């Protein structure tokens, strides 16, 4: 019944309430890694052309799944503020559910023919097109169901119940792995039905315990169609932030593409080791959005700032240990990917450089999440994109023309995540000041 | 620039044409400048016309980022002028913000010829011709964003005459520079399609200098003032973010609507472009009254004079709708006369006539959309035109046309669902605006 943080809550009591929100969210994202990694093992069982049709379609789903951030943010942030304000959050759910159902319609029928038409700028023949169509025919069949499940995740996370979406995720992963492995060995369509069936089951779940059980709230009868204007206004900066950043990664990765085909491999190898250390900060970002959102809606700003200050220092300590393990044991972490010793050379240089900025990378997530919970979704859009260019790409684009070294993009990457962190603890200090 | 709530009808619409007509002249000159630019490029080869016309349609998509700096500058200056506050921090921040967003386009923005151009069916020479045409254009994109922000600063302050004077200078410079370089007038070498690009680039560097010269030596729309306040960057970005997404998604949304008419041969697609240009000349009117409404509603909203703000937009709505009643009637009564400059196949005249006879009925409602989309922009609700002009588009234009065309094949189905959608969209606005006005009082 709403997790408020009192302004003098002991440090120990605050953190033990952050991990109760973060750990279930982290498990959902850790299972997402296993769900996709096992999916790669199931598609690489027949022809290698099915591996190419999947990896290029999954990355094409990354740019496409940015529309989910529109309905997620509007649902997750407004529910958190309402629950904190001791208010009925019933209209926000089925307005976001209705909102997610609408934005998914342009991807219905029309979105299906957008990837096949796009598969003519890489050399994709009629065979790669036909195979990639089998995999995406059931996926694009049931997109509104995937958009409705994503709104239930935001509704659960906003209300403070992140355990139950983890339970459904544990069922969703086994269902996807179970359905795919069974139907794959009958065409690559089986892996596509695993996504479709794991989404209908999660939705059939997310529909059953609404009508029959708890859910974030006991539903009711919505009477407020004017709230989706604020859900669209809230979700718009978050949807653009995730989309523009993914476009900015390809530009930054392009800086390392000029260094042969070994630095690109070493960058991806460190990226996987970075991703394991990234599931934490993203989970603590969503947990901070819930905590800051409910305390903001409760008008308990004294404790809202105390909760985010406590979780900022603690996660910085956790990432400090994470940064220490990365710097101390670089070669140990690359052994599963240790093919060429020269690749290990750049991989060890990468992890040691980015390991310095792991604590700073925690302040960005804890403050972005806090600011998103306060309804300031435009701030992470402005902060994460401005700094990404005039502090990463722009300094690297000029210094690479003189000082040719692949650790120039990696050095400016660590330097910028530390400047972005010092940017957040300033806006937040400013927003809190006017808040008091 | 302040309308009293009991002000006579004439006294408010006089101030409307004072703002709208200079913007209309700006918009009409750009439409006439585009026609003249095609003729200079058509003097080379039809391959150069394809490389130019394809790059321009991409520039329509690319130049959506200008809405980020324009909305932040145009809207906040209008409110600051109404609120009797110094608008200098908004101009210096808009110029700085427009210069920042233009940087990613300055580097990798040019490299879309070997991507978006080459993929969508560009010949072996159309790609190479579009390269040297966009090389000078993308050399001074930051200057293009700086000029555009000055247009928002002028329109926000209520001085739309001076940007018209610069636009008249900008068009003759562009046409003069292109005509001189396309064929080497003064014994100069013929630069080809590159000259068409230098006309755009040189016209921007001159329009920027004229604006800059007026800023320093004539204490301009407002004297630029020392103390900066980089803080409103967030407010300007938050205000410009929905508008930039609106124009960008609309272009991708508009291409979905043309696909419906692509399944009816090349004569319906030709009559659609014919009916578009004829109606687009009537589009530049509503765009000027929209920008004028953003200024008028924006300034009166900043002065806290709400009852007068509602009286000005209602009067502007009921006047533009009368103009679009005359404009719409000319489309109904004289179709073949407007299509005659483009009338080639007698069946193309037949399809273009049914288009103008359908969209001409939705011209008054089209005026209510612009006058209300602009009124809400000036109030700061830039998210409302985003949700209205997109949700109404799919729910009442694309999807109804998608279903009815699967059972009845006729070009009058998406055209009829057009007019029907741009009338249940104007009614979408007047409701929101009436609800937002009530809570504002």
Coordinates of C-alpha atoms in Angstrom, one line a residue, chain B residues 9-441:
Chain B
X9 CA -15.0 42.5 -34.6
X10 CA -13.1 44.6 -37.1
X11 CA -10.5 45.8 -34.6
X12 CA -9.1 42.3 -33.9
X13 CA -9.1 40.9 -37.5
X14 CA -7.3 44.1 -38.6
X15 CA -4.4 43.0 -36.4
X16 CA -4.8 39.5 -37.8
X17 CA -4.1 40.3 -41.4
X18 CA -1.4 42.6 -40.1
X19 CA 0.3 39.4 -38.9
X20 CA -1.0 36.9 -41.4
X21 CA -0.4 38.6 -44.7
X22 CA 3.4 39.1 -44.2
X23 CA 3.6 35.4 -43.3
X24 CA 1.3 34.6 -46.3
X25 CA 3.7 36.5 -48.5
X26 CA 6.6 34.6 -47.0
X27 CA 4.8 31.3 -47.5
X28 CA 3.6 32.1 -51.1
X29 CA 7.1 33.3 -52.2
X30 CA 8.6 30.0 -51.0
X31 CA 6.0 28.2 -53.1
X32 CA 6.8 30.4 -56.1
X33 CA 10.5 30.1 -55.4
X34 CA 10.2 26.3 -55.5
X35 CA 8.5 26.5 -59.0
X36 CA 11.3 28.8 -60.3
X37 CA 14.0 26.5 -58.8
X38 CA 12.6 23.5 -60.7
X39 CA 12.8 25.4 -64.0
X40 CA 16.4 26.3 -63.5
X41 CA 17.2 22.7 -62.8
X42 CA 15.1 21.4 -65.6
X43 CA 17.4 23.3 -68.0
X44 CA 20.0 20.7 -67.3
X45 CA 18.5 17.2 -67.7
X46 CA 15.5 15.3 -66.4
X47 CA 17.9 13.3 -64.3
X48 CA 18.8 16.6 -62.5
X49 CA 15.1 17.2 -61.8
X50 CA 14.9 13.8 -60.2
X51 CA 18.0 14.3 -58.1
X52 CA 16.7 17.7 -57.0
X53 CA 13.1 16.7 -56.4
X54 CA 14.1 13.6 -54.4
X55 CA 16.6 15.6 -52.2
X56 CA 14.0 18.2 -51.5
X57 CA 11.4 15.7 -50.2
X58 CA 14.1 14.4 -47.9
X59 CA 14.8 18.0 -46.8
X60 CA 11.1 18.3 -45.9
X61 CA 11.7 15.3 -43.6
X62 CA 15.1 16.5 -42.4
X63 CA 14.0 20.1 -41.7
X64 CA 11.6 18.8 -39.0
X65 CA 14.4 19.5 -36.4
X66 CA 13.9 23.2 -37.0
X67 CA 10.5 22.9 -35.2
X68 CA 12.4 22.2 -32.0
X69 CA 14.1 25.6 -32.0
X70 CA 11.3 27.4 -33.7
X71 CA 8.5 26.4 -31.3
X72 CA 10.7 27.2 -28.2
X73 CA 11.7 30.6 -29.6
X74 CA 8.4 31.6 -31.3
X75 CA 6.1 30.6 -28.4
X76 CA 8.2 31.8 -25.4
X77 CA 9.0 35.1 -27.0
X78 CA 5.3 35.8 -27.6
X79 CA 4.5 35.1 -24.0
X80 CA 7.4 37.1 -22.7
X81 CA 6.4 40.1 -24.9
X82 CA 2.8 39.8 -23.5
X83 CA 4.0 39.3 -19.9
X84 CA 6.1 42.5 -20.3
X85 CA 9.4 40.7 -19.7
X86 CA 12.8 40.8 -21.4
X87 CA 12.8 38.2 -24.3
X88 CA 16.5 38.4 -24.9
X89 CA 17.4 35.1 -23.1
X90 CA 15.0 33.2 -25.4
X91 CA 16.7 34.6 -28.6
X92 CA 20.2 33.9 -27.5
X93 CA 19.2 30.4 -26.3
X94 CA 17.2 29.7 -29.4
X95 CA 20.1 30.7 -31.7
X96 CA 22.4 28.5 -29.5
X97 CA 19.9 25.6 -29.5
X98 CA 19.3 25.8 -33.2
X99 CA 23.1 25.8 -33.8
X100 CA 23.4 22.7 -31.6
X101 CA 20.7 20.6 -33.3
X102 CA 22.2 21.5 -36.7
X103 CA 25.6 20.0 -35.7
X104 CA 24.6 16.3 -36.2
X105 CA 23.1 17.3 -39.6
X106 CA 26.3 19.1 -40.4
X107 CA 28.4 15.9 -40.2
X108 CA 26.3 12.8 -41.0
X109 CA 23.2 14.6 -42.3
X110 CA 24.7 14.8 -45.8
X111 CA 25.5 11.1 -46.0
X112 CA 21.8 10.2 -46.7
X113 CA 22.3 10.2 -50.5
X114 CA 24.1 6.9 -50.3
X115 CA 21.3 5.6 -48.0
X116 CA 17.8 7.0 -48.1
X117 CA 18.2 8.3 -51.6
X118 CA 19.9 5.3 -53.1
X119 CA 17.5 2.7 -51.6
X120 CA 14.2 4.2 -52.7
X121 CA 15.0 3.8 -56.4
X122 CA 17.6 6.3 -57.4
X123 CA 19.5 5.8 -60.7
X124 CA 23.2 5.5 -61.0
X125 CA 23.4 9.3 -61.8
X126 CA 20.6 10.5 -59.6
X127 CA 22.7 9.6 -56.6
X128 CA 25.8 11.3 -58.0
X129 CA 23.9 14.4 -59.0
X130 CA 22.2 14.7 -55.6
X131 CA 25.6 14.6 -53.9
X132 CA 27.0 17.9 -55.4
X133 CA 23.6 19.4 -54.9
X134 CA 23.5 18.7 -51.2
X135 CA 27.2 19.4 -50.6
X136 CA 26.8 23.2 -50.4
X137 CA 23.4 22.9 -48.8
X138 CA 24.8 20.8 -45.9
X139 CA 27.8 23.1 -45.6
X140 CA 25.7 25.8 -44.0
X141 CA 22.9 24.0 -42.3
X142 CA 23.8 25.7 -39.0
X143 CA 23.2 29.0 -40.8
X144 CA 19.9 27.6 -42.0
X145 CA 18.8 26.9 -38.5
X146 CA 20.0 30.3 -37.3
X147 CA 17.9 32.1 -39.9
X148 CA 14.9 30.0 -39.1
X149 CA 15.1 30.8 -35.4
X150 CA 15.1 34.5 -36.3
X151 CA 11.9 34.0 -38.1
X152 CA 10.4 32.6 -34.9
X153 CA 11.8 35.4 -32.9
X154 CA 10.2 38.0 -35.2
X155 CA 6.9 36.2 -35.4
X156 CA 6.8 35.8 -31.7
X157 CA 7.5 39.5 -31.1
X158 CA 4.7 40.4 -33.5
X159 CA 6.9 41.8 -36.2
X160 CA 6.2 39.7 -39.3
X161 CA 6.9 42.5 -41.8
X162 CA 10.7 42.6 -41.4
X163 CA 11.2 38.8 -42.0
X164 CA 9.1 39.3 -45.2
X165 CA 11.6 42.0 -46.4
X166 CA 14.4 39.5 -45.7
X167 CA 12.5 36.8 -47.5
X168 CA 12.0 39.0 -50.6
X169 CA 15.8 39.5 -50.4
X170 CA 16.3 35.8 -49.8
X171 CA 14.3 34.7 -52.8
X172 CA 15.9 37.1 -55.4
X173 CA 19.3 36.1 -54.0
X174 CA 18.5 32.4 -54.3
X175 CA 17.0 32.7 -57.8
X176 CA 19.8 35.1 -58.9
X177 CA 22.6 32.9 -57.5
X178 CA 21.1 29.8 -59.0
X179 CA 20.4 31.3 -62.4
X180 CA 23.9 32.8 -62.6
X181 CA 25.6 29.5 -61.7
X182 CA 23.4 27.0 -63.4
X183 CA 24.4 28.3 -66.9
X184 CA 27.2 30.7 -66.2
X185 CA 25.6 34.0 -66.9
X186 CA 28.6 36.3 -66.4
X187 CA 30.9 34.1 -68.5
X188 CA 31.3 32.0 -65.4
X189 CA 31.5 28.2 -65.6
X190 CA 28.3 26.2 -65.6
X191 CA 28.1 24.7 -62.1
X192 CA 25.2 22.4 -62.9
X193 CA 23.0 21.2 -60.1
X194 CA 25.7 22.4 -57.7
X195 CA 24.7 26.0 -58.6
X196 CA 21.1 25.2 -57.5
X197 CA 22.5 24.3 -54.1
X198 CA 24.8 27.3 -53.8
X199 CA 21.7 29.5 -54.5
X200 CA 20.1 28.0 -51.3
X201 CA 23.4 28.3 -49.3
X202 CA 24.3 31.8 -50.3
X203 CA 20.7 33.0 -49.8
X204 CA 20.9 31.7 -46.2
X205 CA 24.3 33.3 -45.4
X206 CA 22.9 36.6 -46.6
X207 CA 19.6 36.3 -44.8
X208 CA 21.6 35.4 -41.7
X209 CA 23.9 38.5 -42.1
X210 CA 20.9 40.8 -42.6
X211 CA 19.3 39.4 -39.5
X212 CA 22.6 39.7 -37.6
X213 CA 23.2 43.2 -38.9
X214 CA 19.7 44.2 -37.7
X215 CA 20.3 42.6 -34.3
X216 CA 23.5 44.6 -33.5
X217 CA 22.8 48.0 -35.2
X218 CA 19.0 48.4 -34.7
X219 CA 18.3 46.8 -31.3
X220 CA 15.9 44.4 -33.4
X221 CA 12.6 42.7 -32.2
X222 CA 14.2 43.3 -28.8
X223 CA 17.6 44.5 -27.7
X224 CA 19.7 41.4 -27.1
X225 CA 20.9 41.6 -23.6
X226 CA 24.1 40.6 -21.7
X227 CA 23.1 38.1 -19.0
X228 CA 22.3 34.7 -20.5
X229 CA 20.1 32.2 -18.7
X230 CA 20.7 28.7 -20.1
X231 CA 17.9 27.1 -18.1
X232 CA 15.0 27.8 -20.5
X233 CA 16.7 25.3 -22.8
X234 CA 14.7 22.6 -21.0
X235 CA 11.5 24.6 -21.4
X236 CA 12.2 25.3 -25.1
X237 CA 13.1 21.7 -25.8
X238 CA 10.0 20.5 -23.9
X239 CA 7.9 22.9 -26.0
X240 CA 9.6 22.1 -29.3
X241 CA 9.8 18.3 -28.9
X242 CA 6.1 17.5 -29.7
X243 CA 6.1 19.9 -32.7
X244 CA 9.2 18.4 -34.2
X245 CA 7.7 14.9 -33.9
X246 CA 4.4 16.2 -35.4
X247 CA 5.8 17.4 -38.7
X248 CA 8.2 14.4 -38.9
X249 CA 5.6 11.7 -38.3
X250 CA 3.1 13.5 -40.6
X251 CA 5.5 13.2 -43.5
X252 CA 5.8 9.5 -42.8
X253 CA 2.0 9.4 -42.2
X254 CA 1.3 11.3 -45.4
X255 CA 3.2 8.7 -47.5
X256 CA 0.9 6.0 -46.1
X257 CA -2.1 8.0 -47.4
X258 CA -0.5 8.3 -50.9
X259 CA -0.1 4.5 -51.0
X260 CA -3.9 4.1 -51.1
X261 CA -4.0 6.1 -54.3
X262 CA -1.0 4.2 -55.7
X263 CA -3.2 1.1 -56.3
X264 CA -5.3 3.0 -58.9
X265 CA -2.7 3.6 -61.7
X266 CA -0.6 6.5 -62.5
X267 CA -3.5 8.8 -63.5
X268 CA -5.0 8.9 -60.0
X269 CA -1.5 9.5 -58.5
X270 CA -1.0 12.3 -61.0
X271 CA -4.4 13.9 -60.2
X272 CA -3.6 13.6 -56.5
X273 CA -0.5 15.7 -56.9
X274 CA -2.4 18.1 -59.2
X275 CA -5.2 18.5 -56.6
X276 CA -2.5 18.8 -53.9
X277 CA -0.7 21.7 -55.5
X278 CA -4.0 23.5 -56.2
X279 CA -5.0 22.9 -52.6
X280 CA -1.5 23.6 -51.2
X281 CA -1.7 27.2 -52.6
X282 CA -4.7 27.3 -50.3
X283 CA -2.7 25.6 -47.5
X284 CA -0.2 28.5 -47.2
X285 CA -3.1 30.7 -46.1
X286 CA -4.0 28.6 -43.0
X287 CA -0.3 28.2 -42.1
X288 CA 0.1 32.0 -41.9
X289 CA -3.1 32.4 -39.8
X290 CA -1.8 29.5 -37.6
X291 CA 1.5 31.3 -37.0
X292 CA -0.4 34.5 -36.5
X293 CA -2.7 32.8 -34.0
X294 CA 0.3 31.4 -32.1
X295 CA 1.6 35.0 -31.8
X296 CA -1.8 36.5 -30.9
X297 CA -2.8 33.8 -28.5
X298 CA 0.7 33.5 -27.2
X299 CA 1.1 37.2 -26.3
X300 CA -2.4 37.5 -24.7
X301 CA -1.8 34.4 -22.7
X302 CA 1.4 35.9 -21.3
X303 CA -0.3 39.1 -20.3
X304 CA -2.8 37.0 -18.3
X305 CA -5.6 38.6 -20.4
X306 CA -7.4 35.3 -21.0
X307 CA -10.9 36.6 -21.9
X308 CA -9.4 38.7 -24.7
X309 CA -7.3 35.8 -25.9
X310 CA -10.4 33.7 -26.4
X311 CA -12.2 36.6 -28.1
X312 CA -9.3 37.0 -30.6
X313 CA -9.1 33.3 -31.6
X314 CA -12.9 33.0 -31.9
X315 CA -13.0 36.0 -34.2
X316 CA -10.0 34.8 -36.2
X317 CA -11.7 31.4 -36.5
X318 CA -15.0 32.7 -37.7
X319 CA -13.2 35.0 -40.3
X320 CA -10.7 32.5 -41.8
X321 CA -13.6 30.0 -42.1
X322 CA -15.5 32.6 -44.2
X323 CA -12.4 33.0 -46.3
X324 CA -12.1 29.3 -46.7
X325 CA -15.8 29.3 -47.6
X326 CA -14.9 31.5 -50.6
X327 CA -11.7 29.5 -51.2
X328 CA -13.5 26.2 -50.9
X329 CA -16.3 27.4 -53.2
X330 CA -13.9 28.3 -56.0
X331 CA -12.6 24.7 -55.8
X332 CA -16.1 23.3 -56.2
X333 CA -17.4 25.7 -58.9
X334 CA -14.2 26.1 -61.0
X335 CA -12.4 22.7 -60.9
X336 CA -11.4 22.3 -64.6
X337 CA -10.2 25.9 -64.7
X338 CA -7.7 25.3 -61.8
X339 CA -6.6 22.0 -63.2
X340 CA -6.2 23.4 -66.8
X341 CA -2.5 24.5 -66.1
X342 CA -1.9 20.8 -65.4
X343 CA -4.8 19.2 -67.5
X344 CA -3.2 16.7 -69.9
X345 CA -5.2 13.4 -70.0
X346 CA -9.0 14.1 -70.0
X347 CA -9.3 11.3 -67.4
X348 CA -6.7 13.0 -65.2
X349 CA -8.9 16.1 -65.3
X350 CA -11.8 13.9 -64.3
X351 CA -10.0 12.5 -61.2
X352 CA -8.6 15.9 -60.2
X353 CA -12.1 17.4 -60.4
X354 CA -13.6 14.9 -58.0
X355 CA -10.7 15.6 -55.6
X356 CA -11.2 19.4 -55.6
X357 CA -14.9 18.9 -55.3
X358 CA -14.4 16.8 -52.1
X359 CA -11.6 18.7 -50.3
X360 CA -13.2 22.0 -51.1
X361 CA -16.0 21.1 -48.7
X362 CA -13.6 20.6 -45.8
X363 CA -11.8 24.0 -46.2
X364 CA -13.8 25.8 -43.4
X365 CA -13.1 23.0 -41.0
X366 CA -9.5 23.0 -42.2
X367 CA -9.3 26.7 -41.1
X368 CA -10.6 25.8 -37.6
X369 CA -7.8 23.3 -37.3
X370 CA -5.1 25.8 -38.1
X371 CA -6.5 28.6 -36.0
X372 CA -6.9 26.2 -33.0
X373 CA -3.6 24.3 -33.5
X374 CA -1.8 27.7 -33.4
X375 CA -3.8 29.1 -30.5
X376 CA -2.9 26.1 -28.3
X377 CA 0.7 26.3 -29.4
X378 CA 1.0 29.8 -28.2
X379 CA -0.5 28.7 -24.9
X380 CA 2.3 26.1 -24.6
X381 CA 0.1 23.0 -25.2
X382 CA 2.3 21.8 -28.1
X383 CA 1.4 18.2 -27.2
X384 CA -2.2 18.7 -28.1
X385 CA -1.7 19.2 -31.9
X386 CA 0.6 16.2 -31.8
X387 CA -2.0 13.8 -30.3
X388 CA -4.9 15.4 -32.3
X389 CA -3.4 15.5 -35.8
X390 CA -2.1 11.9 -35.5
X391 CA -4.7 9.9 -33.6
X392 CA -7.5 11.5 -35.7
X393 CA -5.4 10.7 -38.8
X394 CA -5.3 6.9 -38.2
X395 CA -8.7 6.5 -36.5
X396 CA -10.7 8.4 -39.1
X397 CA -8.6 8.5 -42.4
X398 CA -6.2 5.7 -42.7
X399 CA -8.0 2.8 -41.0
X400 CA -11.5 3.6 -42.4
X401 CA -10.0 3.9 -45.9
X402 CA -8.1 0.6 -45.3
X403 CA -11.3 -1.3 -44.5
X404 CA -13.7 0.3 -47.0
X405 CA -11.2 -0.1 -49.9
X406 CA -11.0 -3.9 -49.2
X407 CA -14.7 -4.1 -50.2
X408 CA -15.2 -1.1 -52.5
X409 CA -12.4 -0.1 -54.9
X410 CA -12.7 3.6 -55.8
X411 CA -10.5 6.7 -55.4
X412 CA -13.4 8.5 -53.8
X413 CA -13.1 6.3 -50.7
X414 CA -9.8 7.7 -49.3
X415 CA -10.7 11.1 -50.7
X416 CA -14.0 11.0 -48.9
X417 CA -12.5 9.8 -45.7
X418 CA -9.9 12.6 -46.0
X419 CA -12.6 15.4 -46.0
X420 CA -14.5 13.5 -43.3
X421 CA -11.4 13.2 -41.2
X422 CA -10.4 16.9 -41.5
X423 CA -13.8 17.8 -40.2
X424 CA -14.0 15.5 -37.2
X425 CA -10.5 16.8 -36.5
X426 CA -11.5 20.5 -36.4
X427 CA -14.3 19.4 -34.0
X428 CA -11.7 17.6 -32.0
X429 CA -9.8 20.9 -31.5
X430 CA -12.8 23.1 -30.6
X431 CA -13.6 21.1 -27.4
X432 CA -10.1 20.7 -26.0
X433 CA -9.7 24.5 -26.6
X434 CA -13.1 25.1 -25.1
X435 CA -12.2 22.9 -22.1
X436 CA -8.8 24.4 -21.7
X437 CA -10.3 27.9 -21.9
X438 CA -12.8 27.1 -19.2
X439 CA -10.3 25.9 -16.7
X440 CA -8.2 28.9 -17.6
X441 CA -11.1 31.1 -16.3

